[PDB]
């Protein structure tokens, strides 16, 4: 038998992982049959922390939990209600560990939008109806911080739509101080922001459909305004009025519209604020100190760190995090060097006439993330090993002597593991390696000094079984040389792939700015089924615009968001035809989200290479998508800037060319990210041009189309289309 569509949809063969929460420097928490257990890495033993009977107290309504830093209180999340990608609503209740009972006095209210423990100690802050609250002791009344909150207008301590999605990648917009004296938070005003309005039909019992509306700044429209504040939590009393204090400036960014795009506490009276203009080629990192004699946070021009880019935009999607040292003088930051390569370089708290930073890495590769920073060493991930951009390995570097650069996960299992993700302890004396691919995922615990594997946490032995009678596909990671430079690709080849024979080709495409589809990770997804059962080669290609390969490749599509990554996906297909194992008459392409836009543009190009293709929730033109993301790569839709390419990079302009192909357009009606409008315009243009196509809407489904039945329906519907396109059924 083969890896059938049913096996993917019903999820019979489950790829396991090992989630753990580092509580101490040598202790973590892990789940087992709904019983959270405490593990001490000092020895090889485990102690019972909190039983399944405790979570059972609320039934199956427990969605998540969160233990306090002092290990005396547990935050029990329940009645989970999703909103957008990261935002959600839930009820809460605190569990005491010593007394072993619930705290039923001064409770957390219903529909709490966010909660957080402090960095150190059992302090609680939370957002409710767009207003921030502080709770010093779980049993004591909460002190109200803000009273300006209003639904979809004024947000206190939480992000609106665009900030949640494109900036922080999270709903929370508040940050506790290290010891717990202060509580920083951002405030957003959506008064000028226009509303997207779509219909929600709900269950069939609902007679009249509800009109959902969201403050949504489309490209060129009025954005939200931001305001940063800090409130002293140690001075909160019901006798005196709680008065937060606002950090103004920088003067350079406040010339026009701007964004708050990161914040990190350095010390108890020092904090770094990352800012960014609407034209996202100018970022300022202002470090500010608390003047306790006048109760105002001072932000001098000497402690500012400017970051700019002539070729495109700052960072990959945003200016990276600064990792400060314990004392709070030096901070490390992933920045593009003179050759155009993302590398770690050291800054001090004071700036320099021309802020040159000492790059601790110089090679022709990029640093992915800074995982930890100790007193004498630094942990980071890079794509250096075997010169593969799609690879991930853990590296260790010394601050004093930069030449000491040891790899931690390179040769642990070089065949099975070429893609790692790490979860370090507090001071990084123990760590967990997360082997993702290309073999069966493997998870192991380690000691920092000896690099010695303590044990095997999860090796997918159950997944090793079950797949004993299945025709497993094989992943092939490789590259080609185009125009004096490498371009890596991926291929999920059918089982027992024969080079002499010809197969149907499907181009799996996303190809967004700083995207990477060609990697060494293992996945049991829809592509696995198409190779295992239908004998279809599912390929992927990272052309010009893709990331982790320098800023020459990534910024090639600056102000040109639908041209090079369109043509490079066509060229990639032509190169696969030359290899001699692809049927030229049965070549297709499919993509979700940005991939839908690329798919649609590829089909609209009229190259003659692709027979059919499927666009799922595609962007149609860039004026319809949000401002932050769109204006990062494109300009503003004005004659003064870049309106001409806005008008030329639309899908519906190329509607006449769809007569040469078979097109399947899919889109969820309640999509808050890429609105149903976009496909609605595409389809209307195809109708006017007199070109026949296939369509499918999904009632009340959002961008993910992640409802169980809707997920089963779309991938089953797409399979029928692909069988009919290649003449299989």
């Amino acid at each position: 038998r083969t890896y059938t569509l049913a096996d993917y949809l019903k999820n019979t063969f489950r790829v396991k992982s090992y989630s753990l929460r580092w509580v101490s420097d040598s202790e973590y928490l892990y789940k087992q049959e709904n019983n959270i257990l405490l593990f001490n890495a000092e020895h090889g033993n485990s102690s019972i922390f909190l039983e399944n009977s405790t979570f059972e107290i609320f039934g199956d309504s427990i969605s998540d939990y969160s233990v306090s830093p002092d290990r005396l209180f547990v935050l029990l999340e329940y009645n989970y209600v999703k909103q957008w990608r990261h935002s959600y609503t839930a009820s809460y209740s605190i569990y005491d560990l010593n007394k072993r009972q619930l705290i039923t006095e001064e409770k957390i209210p219903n529909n709490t939008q966010w909660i957080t423990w402090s960095q150190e100690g059992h302090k609680l802050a939370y957002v409710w109806k767009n207003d921030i609250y502080v709770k010093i002791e779980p049993h004591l009344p909460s002190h109200r911080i803000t009273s300006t909150g209003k639904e979809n207008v004024i947000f206190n301590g939480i992000n609106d739509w665009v900030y949640e999605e494109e900036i922080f990648g999270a709903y929370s917009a508040l940050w506790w101080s290290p010891n717990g004296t202060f509580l920083a938070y951002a405030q957003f005003n959506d008064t000028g922001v226009p509303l997207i309005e779509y219909s929600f039909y709900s269950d069939e019992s609902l007679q009249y459909p509800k009109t959902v509306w969201i403050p949504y700044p489309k490209a060129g429209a009025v954005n939200p305004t931001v305001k940063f504040f800090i409130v002293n939590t140690d001075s909160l009393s019901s006798t005196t009025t709680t008065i937060p204090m606002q950090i103004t400036a920088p003067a350079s960014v406040t010339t026009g519209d701007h964004y708050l795009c990161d914040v990190a506490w350095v010390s108890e009276d020092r904090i770094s604020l990352q800012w960014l203009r609407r034209i996202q080629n100018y970022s300022v990192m202002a470090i500010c100190d608390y003047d306790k004699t006048t109760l105002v946070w001072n932000c001098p021009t000497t402690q500012e760190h400017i970051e700019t880019s002539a070729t495109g935009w700052c960072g990959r999607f945003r200016p990276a995090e600064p990792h400060f040292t314990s004392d709070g003088s030096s901070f490390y930051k992933i920045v593009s060097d003179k050759d155009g390569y993302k590398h770690i370089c050291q800054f001090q708290k004071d700036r320099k006439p021309e802020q040159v930073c000492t790059f601790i890495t110089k090679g022709a590769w990029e640093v992915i993330s800074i995982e930890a920073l100790t007193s004498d060493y630094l942990y980071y991930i890079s794509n250096e090993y075997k010169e593969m951009p799609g690879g991930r390995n853990l590296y260790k570097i010394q601050l004093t002597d930069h030449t000491n650069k040891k790899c931690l996960s390179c040769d642990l299992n070089p065949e099975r593991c070429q893609y790692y993700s790490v979860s370090l302890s507090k001071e990084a004396k123990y760590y967990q390696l997360g082997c993702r691919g290309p073999g069966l995922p493997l998870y192991t615990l380690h000691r920092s000094t000896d690099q010695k594997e303590l044990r095997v946490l999860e090796d997918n032995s159950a997944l090793d079984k079950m797949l004993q009678d299945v025709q497993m596909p094989s992943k092939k990671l490789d590259f080609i040389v185009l125009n004096e430079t490498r371009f890596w690709y991926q291929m999920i080849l059918p089982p027992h792939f024969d080079k002499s024979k010809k197969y149907p080709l499907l181009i799996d495409v996303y190809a967004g700015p700083c995207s990477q589809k060609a990697d060494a990770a293992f996945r049991l997804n829809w592509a696995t089924y198409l190779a295992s059962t239908e004998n279809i080669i599912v390929a992927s290609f990272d052309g010009r615009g893709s990331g982790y390969q320098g800023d020459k490749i990534m910024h090639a599509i600056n102000k040109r968001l639908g041209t090079l990554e369109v043509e490079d996906q066509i060229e990639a297909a032509r190169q696969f035809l030359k290899m001699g194992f692809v049927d030229s008459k049965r070549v297709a392409i499919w993509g979700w989200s940005y991939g839908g836009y690329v798919t649609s543009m590829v089909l609209g190009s009229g190259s003659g290479v692709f027979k059919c293709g499927i666009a799922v929730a595609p962007v149609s033109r860039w004026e319809y998508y949000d401002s932050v993301y769109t204006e990062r790569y494109m300009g503003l839709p004005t004659p003064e800037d870049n309106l001409d390419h806005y008008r030329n990079s639309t899908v519906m302009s190329r509607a006449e060319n769809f007569k040469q192909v078979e097109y399947l357009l899919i889109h969820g009606t309640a999509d808050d990210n890429v609105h149903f409008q976009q496909s609605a315009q595409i389809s209307k243009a195809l109708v006017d041009a007199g070109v026949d196509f296939q369509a499918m809407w999904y009632t009340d489904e959002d961008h993910g189309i992640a409802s169980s039945t809707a997920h089963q329906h779309i991938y089953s519907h797409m399979s029928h289309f692909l069988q009919q396109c290649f003449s299989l059924r």
Partner: antibody, heavy 117, light 107 residues
Framework: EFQLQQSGPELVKPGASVKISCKASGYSFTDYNINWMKQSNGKSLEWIGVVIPKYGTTNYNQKFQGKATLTVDQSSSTAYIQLNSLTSEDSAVYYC??????????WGTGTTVTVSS | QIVLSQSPAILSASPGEKVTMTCRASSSVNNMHWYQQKPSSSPKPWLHGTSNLASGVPVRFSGSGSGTSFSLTISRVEAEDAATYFCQQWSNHPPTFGGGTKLEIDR
């Protein structure tokens, strides 16, 4: 095999309080949890609260927070519910049930409790 | 919390016939449970996880569903099956009950 048994029927005057037990035997009493219910003579059921015999941790319904109080004796393997300050509205049948971290898989005999002058 | 609505109060069907049973929620439910109660007796556990049988429940009883409309089917109703049924929810705390599904028999 697993048996649950409560005290007999009861009568009390308005303003008074009552207590009714739920003795259990067979399974390891400390492992599984105890939940209590309420049902009027001709109405639907109503959830009151829940206890874990091991630590004696309680969690009540908001509707019965300032009325019912739950306790347990793990040596005798007997759970209790303590109804404070009754009225004519409290006249109903009460049940004690066990939870298998899934649903109410074990049930007691059931006990009618009347409140009248 | 979640107001479950049983459909309808009393329902009759002859011995050996099909009998379907549904519990309509207001918000949403991940996993619906069911309970049988004979008059003047304690409720008994019937179907947990919507489909799976309890320790002692016969094989003719089985259910399914999702969202705000779950179900429970009874293959060939017997004389002993004449008893009131209730649907239970606990995907959201506090847990709630139905109202009345009195399984009548047509003789």
């Amino acid at each position: 095999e697993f048996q649950l048994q409560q005290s007999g029927p009861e009568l009390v005057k308005p303003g008074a309080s009552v207590k009714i037990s739920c003795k259990a035997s067979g399974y390891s009493f400390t492992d599984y949890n105890i939940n209590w219910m309420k049902q009027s003579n001709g109405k639907s059921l109503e959830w009151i609260g829940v206890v874990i015999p091991k630590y004696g941790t309680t969690n009540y319904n908001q509707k019965f927070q300032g009325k019912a109080t739950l306790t347990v004796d793990q040596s005798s393997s007997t759970a209790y519910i303590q109804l404070n300050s009754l009225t004519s509205e409290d006249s109903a049948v009460y049940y004690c049930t066990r939870f298998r971290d899934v649903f109410f898989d074990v049930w007691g005999t059931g006990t009618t409790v009347t409140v009248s002058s | 919390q979640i107001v479950l609505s049983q459909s309808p109060a009393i329902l009759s069907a002859s011995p050996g016939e099909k009998v379907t049973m549904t519990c309509r929620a207001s918000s949403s439910v991940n996993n619906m449970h069911w309970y049988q109660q004979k008059p003047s007796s304690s409720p008994k556990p019937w179907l947990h996880g919507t489909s799976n049988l309890a320790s002692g429940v016969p094989v003719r009883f089985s259910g399914s569903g999702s969202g705000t409309s779950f179900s429970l089917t009874i293959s060939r109703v017997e004389a002993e099956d004449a008893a009131t049924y209730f649907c239970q929810q606990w995907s959201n705390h506090p847990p709630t009950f139905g109202g009345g599904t009195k399984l009548e028999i047509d003789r």
